[PDB]
Design a protein around this ligand. Structure first.
Ligand SMILES: [Zn+2]
Ligand SMILES: [Zn+2]
Lengths: 23, 22, 22, 21
């Protein structure tokens, strides 16, 4: 199954996408 | 309200904590 | 360190906010 | 860019994967 580091990597990648949005 | 940048910062902090799990 | 359940809870909270971004 | 709804869906899925650790 996916490791904690793998799950955290997807969370960080998702954060990068959220970051791109404007308020 | 909190900007997307602010929500993304919180998400990065949570990711660092997930990294410490087993 | 923070439990998986505590971290999942905060992530779900964050998702609620992300989904309501305009 | 990905929609807020789409990004929230991915985040919810990851939350449940974290939960089940
Ligand atoms: Zn705007
Ligand atoms: Zn788009």
């Amino acid at each position: 199954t996916a490791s904690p580091r793998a799950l955290a990597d997807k969370l960080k990648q998702l954060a990068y996408k959220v970051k791109r949005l404007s308020s | 309200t909190a900007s997307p940048r602010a929500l993304a910062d919180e998400l990065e902090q949570l990711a660092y904590e997930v990294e410490r799990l087993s």
